[PDB]
Design a protein around this ligand. Structure first.
Ligand SMILES: [Mg+2]
Ligand SMILES: [Mg+2]
Ligand SMILES: [Mg+2]
Lengths: 72, 121, 75, 55, 57, 143, 189, 104, 145
RNA sequence: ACGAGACUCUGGCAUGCUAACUAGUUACGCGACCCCCGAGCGGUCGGCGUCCCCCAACUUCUUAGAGGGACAAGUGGCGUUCAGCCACCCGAGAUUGAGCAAUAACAGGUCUGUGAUGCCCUUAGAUGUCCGGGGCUGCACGCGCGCUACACUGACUGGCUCAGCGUGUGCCUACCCUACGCCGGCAGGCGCGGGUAACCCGUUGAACCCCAUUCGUGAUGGGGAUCGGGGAUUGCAAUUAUUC
């Protein structure tokens, strides 16, 4: 990944790591009381972003963009 | 004079240090093989020089190799160089030793102009 | 607005002007002082750091493109 | 003829040495993975080699 | 042993084998009803099986 | 507590340790330290005339992180973008002579040594001073 | 309570008109430390309304073609300029932002298909999404044309634009087109 | 013997690959050997893309041709003279097979 | 940085054969003369052992001619052989940097000597066409019309 | 019934399964480090080993097979209450992108892709074929597709930190990717290995970006056209400039 893509992966991982440790080695009534607060705020801390990228097609420079058509 | 050294030292000096007063391209070209085709042209040029009567311009020699560098050995020669249709006439004088025979025989007559026809809306 | 082109090591006549006026307002950036009296912008940051050495202007931002300064506390 | 200049020009490096392996053509070649086949013939034999239009 | 071919070219090399093999048997067994070929490859003793409609001729 | 180079801001750390070679002048500087043009993709040779010391500080820190690197690896690290002018810009590596000279420069100070594999890595004492400086800058940075 | 950038507590901002109480997204619920979150706020409709305002202006500022991947840069542009605001006025950057938005949000516009006289035929009131959508856009365009060839850069170039818009002085480029759009709609009522 | 022999295989189609390897794996179990399971490499995709038209006339359409190469290998600690027969009784004419000795 | 403008701050100079402006920085003021670029100005400045942060105007008399001796005889003043303009001159062969109207007439020497030899490059120079092998079908139109 | 859809590939989820010395992760035993007055299970290591058979296990990470999983399913609202649509909950995912693609048509392009071809032309002073040189670039002009810019949401110098596709030594065919050490300012050169490849290049130390300095609104430290000189590389040959 890149700088920010990494920067999101760290915070996403440590949030999952904490709750996973909380669920396993102590009462998860505490984990449920920590799972809620970081859900009502920035749901991305646990749910991973499912959109990666889109392939490029042979009609233009990018995925949806097309090479500029000239007919005059 | 050529590089602060006059033409007198140019004629008698050897190949292993004319590379340095040559530019990078001609130095590289002589650093590698000098084939049998251009040796014969120099051979035939020498025979033309000796066959020239005194104070007389040696006879025209024709060639296809419009890629030879000019050497001190054959300065003062009448060399005809093909451009694809005819042998252009070129005289050889001291100040080209770092050029080519093709650089002088131009391969196309320059365009003057023509009145636009059906195109050029 | 055509051209200013008039700034070479701001003189004593200007010198007294900014030294008694700049510390009396809050918005000090090398750009505004460049607009305010006439300053170009190179010696602007030289002037602000020279003032910053005196201890009468307080630096808040300290960034590359933006070095933001403010006047002292009053009272 | 004679043997001294018939092939004097080197069929070394370049388009002269390279050619298609089906039509002896020297245009639209594909040397990737050592095919040495032109693009028209490669499309023609693609299934036999095993290049499949998956997606 | 000394000079072995890269795997990507190797599967190409087998692929370019059957392509031309099928092509030549097509021009050779056209009137015989070629109807395709199968090359039963083994590391040493490769065998080729023709699928002619009239194998008798 | 500590202190390694990882827990100190590398931007301030590389400035601090470059001062160390400036203070303890033994790093042999080549003749051309004024005229290299420094990584061909670049022009307008570096502003700081001590650019060889900040380079030496920088390459020492880099090797401490990812050791077993040679001259070619150094040129890739410092390679920037070459602006081809009218042609679109590309990536080009740094000059090999400067990276070669600094690599031998640390040899004369016995911070780095050749290894069984290609490249050179910091010696026990070589990384020792690097951690001393890392502690020095941290304590200065901390207060 | 959220110490945005380590300061500027949320629970003091007030918004006047009932319409953008629903829309202004500076409330403590969506009180983020930074204006940066790839939260799919444009994948569906109606989500950009609840996207935080501080994210919106730093997301519109990232627009001239030459700066399209500069989000972290636009975060520093707002975070710096927010210092210039709080330095000059002493109150909340967040408050004056909202006052600038509601003041600079054009209400009446003109759109039709008949033979338009000057802009269009029929004057049409705006919805309170394009109103806040457009209002940010003048502010972003209001710093861009000023910071193009001036000595002063975007941090102050944005800064003076908001405070001029917030108080109302007819000298900000944003509110200068606002009333102009309003009066042309009143012209062709 | 006891020999640390490895057997590898590779092809383009996977359905035969799954069965033929497992055939060697099961042959190993009925031979009661210290057997290392099938270690499988990342697939290799060949990505030849072609103009799709014989002439120059078209609408700039292209042809994306693919070929997938999958390679797997098994490892054993059993004598060569007692493992040759099993690796020989499985043929699968669509597959490529290579052997190497314990010391490699 | 000073209380008043430096007393001998020269707003205009008369170095060589032009008037370089004094307000501009020294490294980019001396470069205004023909024959010196950004790198040549910077290296000769370092050999002069003068700081870069100052302007051209306050550069006092001693450094006025110290630079001039640097950049007319680079060879003996430890300027590298790779840096010169007229390296291996086509007539004299001395490694020298030409930096004046001399450069104006030296460059003028090439156009005639190629013209006097009727080289294809010289003829294209004479006719005003491109000399390095460019394409003139759809470019260079502004020079004729 | 064909086409659409369905279908195949691809992307996202499985701390579920099968496995990993050509991927590794933790734990350990070291070795250097550092604070040490002692701390100490302090932490740094892409430094070493942990399959020469335990000196430890395991698959979370990586890879790829089998699978499962999503279906307007649940909840409300609308709708003839139909087909469906809207919103919400739980969810990785509530529309991921492609490939294929009907009946046909067009004097569409292709005889310069083919030992695909009908007919015509030419066939020894060849329109066969080879060799040499030139040309396909040639410029009063017009059009199209693009790249670089018109800058201080910026150039310059220095430093910090990050990827994914995919390639790599040859039937012909000689032409591969390259680490490291040395010389050169660069261009490069010289030795020295590795790699037919999840082994080496390569932890692919990419750019933008990020953090400090200079510039100061000036056609300027923008912009890099044209233009002179010099040096290297490819080749048998570089001029009309191969490239750098
Ligand atoms: Mg593009
Ligand atoms: Mg379908
Ligand atoms: Mg030029």
């Amino acid at each position: 990944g890149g700088h920010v893509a990494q920067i999101y992966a760290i915070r996403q991982s440590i949030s999952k790591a904490l709750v996973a440790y909380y669920q396993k080695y102590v009462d998860e009534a505490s984990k449920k009381e920590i799972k809620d607060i970081l859900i009502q705020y920035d749901r991305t801390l646990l749910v991973a972003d499912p959109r990666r990228c889109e392939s490029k097609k042979f009609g233009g420079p990018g995925a949806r963009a097309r090479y500029q058509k000239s007919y005059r | 004079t050529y590089r602060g050294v006059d033409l007198d030292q140019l004629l008698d000096m050897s190949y292993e240090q004319l590379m340095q007063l040559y530019s990078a391209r001609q130095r590289r070209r002589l650093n590698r093989g000098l084939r049998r085709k251009q040796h014969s042209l120099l051979k035939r040029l020498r025979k033309a020089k000796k066959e020239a009567p005194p104070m007389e311009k040696p006879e025209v020699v024709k060639t296809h190799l419009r890629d030879m560098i000019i050497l001190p050995e054959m300065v003062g020669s009448m060399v005809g160089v093909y451009n694809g249709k005819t042998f252009n006439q070129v005289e050889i004088k001291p100040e080209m030793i770092g050029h080519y025979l093709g650089e002088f025989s131009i391969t196309y007559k320059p365009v003057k102009h023509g009145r636009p026809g059906i195109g050029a809306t | 607005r055509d051209k200013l082109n008039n700034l070479v090591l701001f003189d004593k006549a200007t010198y007294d002007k900014l030294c008694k006026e700049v510390p009396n307002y809050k918005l000090i950036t090398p750009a505004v002082v460049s607009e305010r009296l006439k300053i170009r912008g190179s010696l602007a940051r030289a002037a602000l750091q020279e003032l910053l050495s005196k201890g009468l202007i307080k630096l808040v931002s300290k960034h590359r493109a933006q070095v933001i300064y403010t006047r002292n506390t009053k009272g | 003829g004679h043997q001294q200049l018939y092939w004097s020009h080197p069929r070394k490096f370049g388009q002269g040495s390279r050619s298609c392996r089906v039509c002896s053509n020297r245009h639209g070649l594909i040397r990737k993975y050592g095919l040495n086949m032109c693009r028209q013939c490669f499309r023609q034999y693609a299934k036999d080699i095993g290049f499949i239009k998956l997606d | 042993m000394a000079v072995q071919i890269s795997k990507k070219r190797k599967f190409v090399a087998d692929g370019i084998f059957k392509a031309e093999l099928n092509e030549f048997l097509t021009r050779e067994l056209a009137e015989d009803g070629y109807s395709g070929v199968e090359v039963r490859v083994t590391p040493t003793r490769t065998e080729i099986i023709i699928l002619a409609t009239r194998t008798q001729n | 507590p500590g202190v390694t180079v990882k827990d100190v801001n590398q931007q301030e750390f590389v400035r601090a340790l470059a001062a160390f070679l400036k203070k303890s002048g033994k790093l042999k500087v080549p003749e051309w330290v004024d005229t290299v043009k420094l990584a061909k993709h670049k022009e307008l040779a570096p502003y700081d005339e001590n650019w060889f010391y900040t380079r030496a500080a920088s390459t020492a820190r880099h090797l401490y992180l990812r050791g077993g690197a040679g001259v070619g690896s150094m040129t890739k690290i410092y390679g920037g973008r070459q602006r081809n002018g009218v042609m679109p810009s590309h990536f080009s590596r740094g000059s090999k002579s400067v990276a070669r000279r600094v690599l031998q420069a640390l040899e004369g100070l016995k911070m780095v040594e050749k290894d069984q594999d290609g490249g050179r890595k910091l010696t026990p004492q070589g990384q020792r001073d690097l951690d001393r400086i890392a502690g020095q800058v941290a304590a200065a940075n901390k207060k | 309570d959220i110490k945005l950038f380590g300061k500027w507590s949320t629970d003091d901002v007030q918004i006047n008109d009932i319409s953008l109480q629903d829309y202004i997204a500076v409330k403590e619920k969506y009180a983020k430390y930074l204006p940066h979150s790839a939260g799919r706020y444009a994948a569906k409709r109606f989500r950009k309304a609840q996207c935080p305002i501080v994210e919106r202006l730093t997301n519109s500022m990232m627009m001239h073609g030459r700066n399209n991947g500069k989000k972290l840069m636009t975060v520093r542009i707002v975070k710096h300029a927010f210092e210039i605001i709080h330095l000059l006025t002493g109150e909340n950057p967040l408050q004056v932002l909202v006052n600038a938005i509601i003041n600079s949000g054009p209400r009446e516009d003109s759109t039709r298909i008949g033979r338009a006289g000057t802009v269009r035929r029929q004057a049409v009131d705006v919805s309170p999404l394009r109103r806040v959508n457009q209002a940010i856009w003048l502010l972003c365009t209001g710093a861009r044309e000023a910071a193009f060839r001036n000595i002063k850069t975007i941090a102050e170039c944005l800064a003076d634009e908001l405070i001029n818009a917030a108080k109302g002085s007819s000298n900000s480029y944003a509110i200068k087109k606002k009333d102009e759009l309003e009066r042309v709609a009143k012209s062709n009522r | 013997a006891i020999h640390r022999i490895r057997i590898t295989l590779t092809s383009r189609n996977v359905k035969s690959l799954e069965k033929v390897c497992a055939d060697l794996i099961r042959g190993a179990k009925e031979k009661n050997l210290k057997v290392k399971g099938p270690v499988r490499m990342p697939t290799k995709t060949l990505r030849i893309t072609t103009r799709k038209t014989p002439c120059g006339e078209g609408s700039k359409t292209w042809d994306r041709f693919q070929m997938r190469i999958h390679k797997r290998l098994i490892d054993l600690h059993s004598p060569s003279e007692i493992v040759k027969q099993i690796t020989s009784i499985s043929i699968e004419p669509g597959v490529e097979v290579e052997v190497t000795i314990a010391d490699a | 940085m000073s209380l008043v403008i430096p007393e001998k701050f020269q707003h205009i100079l008369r170095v060589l054969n032009t008037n370089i402006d004094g307000r501009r920085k020294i490294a980019f003021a001396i470069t205004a003369i023909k024959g010196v670029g950004r790198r040549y100005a910077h290296v000769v400045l370092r050999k002069a052992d003068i700081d870069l942060t100052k302007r051209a105007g306050e550069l006092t008399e001693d450094e006025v001619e110290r630079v001039i001796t640097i950049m007319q005889n680079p060879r003996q003043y430890k300027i590298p052989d790779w840096f010169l303009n007229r390296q291996k001159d086509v007539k004299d062969g001395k490694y020298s940097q030409v930096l004046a109207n001399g450069l104006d007439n030296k460059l003028r020497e090439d156009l005639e000597r190629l013209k006097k030899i009727r080289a294809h490059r010289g003829l294209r120079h004479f006719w005003g066409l491109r000399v390095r092998g460019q394409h003139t079908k759809t470019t260079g139109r502004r020079g004729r019309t």
